[PDB]
Design a protein around this ligand. Structure first.
Ligand SMILES: [Mg+2]
Ligand SMILES: [Mg+2]
Ligand SMILES: [Mg+2]
Ligand SMILES: [Mg+2]
Ligand SMILES: [Mg+2]
Ligand SMILES: [Mg+2]
Ligand SMILES: [Mg+2]
Ligand SMILES: [Mg+2]
Ligand SMILES: [Mg+2]
Ligand SMILES: [Mg+2]
Ligand SMILES: [Mg+2]
Ligand SMILES: [Mg+2]
Ligand SMILES: [Mg+2]
Ligand SMILES: [Mg+2]
Ligand SMILES: [Mg+2]
Ligand SMILES: [Mg+2]
Ligand SMILES: [Mg+2]
Ligand SMILES: [Mg+2]
Ligand SMILES: [Mg+2]
Ligand SMILES: [Mg+2]
Ligand SMILES: [Mg+2]
Ligand SMILES: [Mg+2]
Ligand SMILES: [Mg+2]
Ligand SMILES: [Mg+2]
Ligand SMILES: [Mg+2]
Ligand SMILES: [Mg+2]
Ligand SMILES: [Mg+2]
Ligand SMILES: [Mg+2]
Ligand SMILES: [Mg+2]
Ligand SMILES: [Mg+2]
Ligand SMILES: [Mg+2]
Ligand SMILES: [Mg+2]
Ligand SMILES: [Mg+2]
Ligand SMILES: [Mg+2]
Ligand SMILES: [Mg+2]
Ligand SMILES: [Mg+2]
Ligand SMILES: [Mg+2]
Ligand SMILES: [Mg+2]
Ligand SMILES: [Mg+2]
Ligand SMILES: [Mg+2]
Ligand SMILES: [Mg+2]
Ligand SMILES: [Zn+2]
Ligand SMILES: [Zn+2]
Lengths: 91, 149, 114, 69, 50
RNA sequence: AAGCCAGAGGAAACUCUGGUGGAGGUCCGUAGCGGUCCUGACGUGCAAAUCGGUCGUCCGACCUGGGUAUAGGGGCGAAAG
RNA sequence: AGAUCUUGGUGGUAGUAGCAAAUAUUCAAACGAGAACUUUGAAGGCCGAAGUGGAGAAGGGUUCCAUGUGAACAGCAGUUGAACAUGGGUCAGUCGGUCCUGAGAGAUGGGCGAGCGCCGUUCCGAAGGGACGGGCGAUGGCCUCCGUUGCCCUCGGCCGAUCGAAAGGGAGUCGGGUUCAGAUCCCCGAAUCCGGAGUGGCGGAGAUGGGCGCCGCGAGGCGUCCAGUGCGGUAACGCGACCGAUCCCGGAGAAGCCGGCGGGAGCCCCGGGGAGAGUUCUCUUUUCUUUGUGAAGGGCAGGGCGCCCUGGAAUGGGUUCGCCCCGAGAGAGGGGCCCGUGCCUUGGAAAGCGUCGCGGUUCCGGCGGCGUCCGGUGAGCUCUCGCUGGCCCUUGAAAAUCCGGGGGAGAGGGUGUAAAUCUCGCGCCGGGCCGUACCCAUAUCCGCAGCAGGUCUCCAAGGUGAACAGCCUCUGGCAUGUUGGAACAAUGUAGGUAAGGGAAGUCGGCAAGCCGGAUCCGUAACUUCGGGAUAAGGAUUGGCUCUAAGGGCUGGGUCGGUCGCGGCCGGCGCCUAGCAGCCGACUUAGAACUGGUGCGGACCAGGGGAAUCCGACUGUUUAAUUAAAACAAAGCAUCGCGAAGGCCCG
């Protein structure tokens, strides 16, 4: 059945810490414990090992990523910017 | 331990004797194991390469930037941070960068730096939520945590 | 039940004080101080997580008295690297050295002009 | 201890220079010839009663033939 | 304790040897003025320095 | 708690039910650690701070041995001089 | 004569307070001058496996153990003693230290310092004293020839002395016996690790085959030439060795906490067979005890695998308690490896144990007989091993030490019963130094003491039960905690009960009392939607006799058509709604009967509700009068600082 109406994963915290702090940590805890699909083998086994370290069980590929998400939106725009600058370094 | 930024073990070939050199970089976000990095003047713009800021485009952003030409990385080392190359001048061999605190600084064009932002992302976004989690965070760093007013 | 005692002067349940129960021919249970559990070598590739096969799994100083055959496998890198990651290296070394011949021939027809 | 299965290899272990004694122990089902070497105690077990008698009379000279009964 | 050093054990050896009554014939000596061993030490009454 | 299974209702959007799972500075409560109340006992005591009952916490900012470091206007202090 | 004078001695108090924490003693006998206290026996009890049991670390230091004394000490006594006296007792290659490094400590170089010195630990050092290798040599000497040895060439960063763990890392010893007191140390017996062998101890491997000329009837022989630093499997990998330096790469050492399952053992439980006891007023084929196989080899079960080969899967499938896995190769078939602490075997029964005897060496490892058996269960408990998960802004040592691989500088013999070499089998020699007794606590330690305090761990039986709870018991232990006897006043301390009332007592429901387990129902306001919540409230609960449901193993034939009273395949048949027999757990539900309505019968075991103030919560705090509203805390906000820097020590 549906066991919790709205708290979701942060039901482990009970009533503590305040509703908005539990809600803020809810989206982070969902992404932090999520299993992403590895872009090297295609298996959905890329999971967080430590903070900033994402490791794939299947292909044993470890990649440095975000603290909670597999890759942060900041570094995504950075990679596009660097690619744009490299193709602009030559003509 | 005591750091939010992951480290990278990178193995080079020693050029003067038959040996392997094990360096401990600071991981730029996006690097992975079994990936080649290239350090030198002639390296090209890729995430993880270590090349001088003088041989960079006018807007590239760097990860572990030296303060003095010749030492090792000293700036933008904490997780998610980065410097930004602003401008050069071939006269006087200087390069202006934007430090994470927004401070502009003039450094030599021979200062090396990783290309990219340092991994570890937005670690400060998650509320600690617990006196215990702060207790464990500072047990890895130094005896400073319970702060009496 | 017949309760037991330690047979040495180490009275704490540390890692070097593990015991197992043994029934002597005198029909009494006594402690027997076990050796530690050894592990087979990990692969030198540092990628795959399994340990090597065909190699006796003992403490490091037991290898000093083991036979040579018990400590390795009859193959190149045997006893130091897994078979799977050796085949990859044989293919990789061959194919990349083929690539160098390709770029050498490609520049060979590129230097036909002056 | 090392267990000896056949007869002729028990002979030259018994005639080895470091062999000190031979003990013959008769059970309810077999006879055991135990030769005491420097390192091991080699034991040969014979179920046949007549085979044990022949081997006992054929034991090498200059060696203890101690019986355990 | 059971685990002791050689230096400690030898120290206790001297203390044990000299914790004994005076010989009986000492009192017969001329100009004696000694009645009993006044340096007697009991293990429970007083403890050793070490 | 998340995750997972099956079933049902719905024109869809989506919802509901029963299991499974075993989270948590989670609750009751031992050992441990602590020390609320009786302002109980004792108060030339068993004790230069203990005892009885009742109690707080009991997977964690948990309890603990040993090895180390910090020394007097100095140390150390989740702070009471 | 004074100074709360100094020192010493002595009174009254006073034969007084007191010798009251943890249930408990009694009978007979012995020794003895003497017995509440000693010892033995009988009984009644307690600790009740988280012990009042059996062993250790720290600490003590002879308290250990015999014999003797009865002065003093053991707050009564004592024939007893942890007292006194006299003797005796601690046996190691494999148990520790010793070795390694850890947090750290600490020299030298250097710097400072009036100076003893102290800063610093890689920093501002010419910091390698070593190496198989090759050469020049002295032929030191069983001068054939390999060991010496001086020098030279080449190579050589642990880049830092040294110390730092009797709980970390760390090769390799177990079974039985023995003493008044010691044993993994002695003795008996089985092993094993490291080191060594100069003349090299023995085997085995390397390694001993082909081509051609001939002899010889062929077989088998002679001469020449050529290889020969092993071999097998498609693979995983295997076989008994399997040449190899400097150098390089890697592994082991070497890893947190928590959850859930599975394998193995030990214990516990049940059914029988022995042996010995117990009860027998009656019953009870009954109740109790006991019923081994060490290390190290070999073999086989079993457990695991992120190992291999075939093959190519959607109508997706396999599979777990949970998960999870698959065209990056599922399912299936066939293999490989690791662990093997389980079983068999060598050890091994000769020993040990239980019983029944027979002799004696004041006091025999005496001798002898018989046995040391077959089974079944399990969410059981404790270890251990494995698999798979979860948690971390926490990611959970280091170094000695040992090993594998890459590479191929070199070495070795000219086909000899060969050479260099060997991580293979067996054989030979050695392992020095220090510790080792005992207590480890309501009496061997600290607390002035035989002090209700404090002091680090290991093992862990039956019943009830959710349970390592409480309560009763077995193994083991003890004598009620520094005295006993007689009485049963007051006051007390600890524990109960109390008619009718029910907080009227009191500053205040202080204290006590009520409630309490489990099952079935039933649960409000409010709320951060998680909670409140065991809300509140109600019913039931015993004993006995049954009835249901929840499982596991085997076997399912139509037949001699023939014979190796049974099978090589099939003429020969339709469990295909599944049956047959055997075995075995607890649990749940339903019913009848029955008791003076008593039944969570002891034990264990929440009083509840409505509000107000404060602190969010969990945590912490004035050891010895304050546990709080105080501190901390996450969260929020501000400040300084880009290293020639901020803050701080000196
Ligand atoms: Mg504060
Ligand atoms: Mg056994
Ligand atoms: Mg004392
Ligand atoms: Mg809690
Ligand atoms: Mg609680
Ligand atoms: Mg208080
Ligand atoms: Mg009081
Ligand atoms: Mg006077
Ligand atoms: Mg006067
Ligand atoms: Mg009196
Ligand atoms: Mg009294
Ligand atoms: Mg009792
Ligand atoms: Mg004890
Ligand atoms: Mg004694
Ligand atoms: Mg007395
Ligand atoms: Mg004495
Ligand atoms: Mg050096
Ligand atoms: Mg040392
Ligand atoms: Mg140790
Ligand atoms: Mg003893
Ligand atoms: Mg056996
Ligand atoms: Mg398969
Ligand atoms: Mg026997
Ligand atoms: Mg002892
Ligand atoms: Mg005491
Ligand atoms: Mg003192
Ligand atoms: Mg009493
Ligand atoms: Mg008494
Ligand atoms: Mg006492
Ligand atoms: Mg009344
Ligand atoms: Mg009444
Ligand atoms: Mg009133
Ligand atoms: Mg009144
Ligand atoms: Mg009260
Ligand atoms: Mg309420
Ligand atoms: Mg009933
Ligand atoms: Mg509070
Ligand atoms: Mg608040
Ligand atoms: Mg406190
Ligand atoms: Mg106080
Ligand atoms: Mg706020
Ligand atoms: Zn992957
Ligand atoms: Zn591999």
């Amino acid at each position: 059945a549906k066991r919790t109406k709205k708290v979701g994963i942060v039901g482990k915290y009970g009533t503590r810490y305040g509703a908005s702090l539990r809600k803020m940590v809810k989206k982070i805890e969902i992404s932090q414990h999520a299993k992403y699909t590895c872009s090297f083998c295609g298996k959905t086994k890329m999971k967080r090992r430590a903070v900033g370290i994402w490791h794939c069980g299947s292909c044993m590929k470890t990649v440095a990523g975000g603290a909670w998400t597999y890759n942060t939106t900041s570094a995504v725009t950075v990679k596009s910017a660097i690619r744009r600058l490299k193709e602009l370094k030559d003509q | 331990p005591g750091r939010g930024a992951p480290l990278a073990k990178v193995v080079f070939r020693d050029p003067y004797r038959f040996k392997k050199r094990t360096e401990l970089f600071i991981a730029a976000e996006g690097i992975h194991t079994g990936q080649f990095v290239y350090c030198g003047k002639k390296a090209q713009l890729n995430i993880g390469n270590v090349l001088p800021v003088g041989t960079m485009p006018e807007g590239t952003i760097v990860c572990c930037l030296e303060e003095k030409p010749g030492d090792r990385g000293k700036l933008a080392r904490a997780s998610g941070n980065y410097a930004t190359v602003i401008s050069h001048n071939p006269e006087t061999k200087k390069t202006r960068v934007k430090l994470p605190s927004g401070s502009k600084k003039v450094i030599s064009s021979a200062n090396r730096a990783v290309v990219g932002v340092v991994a570890g992302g937005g670690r400060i976004d998650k509320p600690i939520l617990k006196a215990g989690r702060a207790y464990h965070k500072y047990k890895a760093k130094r005896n400073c945590w319970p702060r009496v007013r | 039940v017949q309760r037991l005692t330690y047979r040495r002067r180490l009275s704490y349940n540390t890692a070097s004080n593990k015991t197992r129960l043994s029934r002597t021919p005198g029909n009494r249970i006594v402690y027997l101080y076990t050796k530690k559990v050894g592990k087979a070598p990990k692969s030198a590739c540092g990628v795959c997580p399994g340990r090597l096969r065909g190699v006796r799994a003992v403490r490091p100083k037991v290898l000093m008295r083991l036979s040579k055959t018990k400590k390795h496998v009859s193959r190149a890198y045997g006893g130091s690297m897994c078979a799977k990651c050796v085949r990859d290296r044989i293919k990789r070394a061959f194919l990349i050295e083929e690539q160098k011949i390709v770029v050498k021939v490609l520049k060979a027809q590129a230097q036909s002009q002056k | 201890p090392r267990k000896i299965e056949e007869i002729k290899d028990f002979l030259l272990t018994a005639r080895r220079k470091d062999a000190k004694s031979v003990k013959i122990k008769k059970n309810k089902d077999n006879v055991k010839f135990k030769v005491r070497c420097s390192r091991y105690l080699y034991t040969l077990v014979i179920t046949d009663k007549e085979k044990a008698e022949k081997l006992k009379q054929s034991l090498p000279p200059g060696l203890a033939v101690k019986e355990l009964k | 304790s059971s685990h002791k050093t050689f230096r400690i054990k030898r120290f206790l050896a001297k203390k044990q040897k000299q914790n004994r009554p005076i010989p009986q014939w000492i009192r017969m000596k001329t100009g004696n003025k000694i009645r009993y061993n006044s340096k007697r030490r009991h293990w429970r009454r007083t403890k050793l320095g070490l």
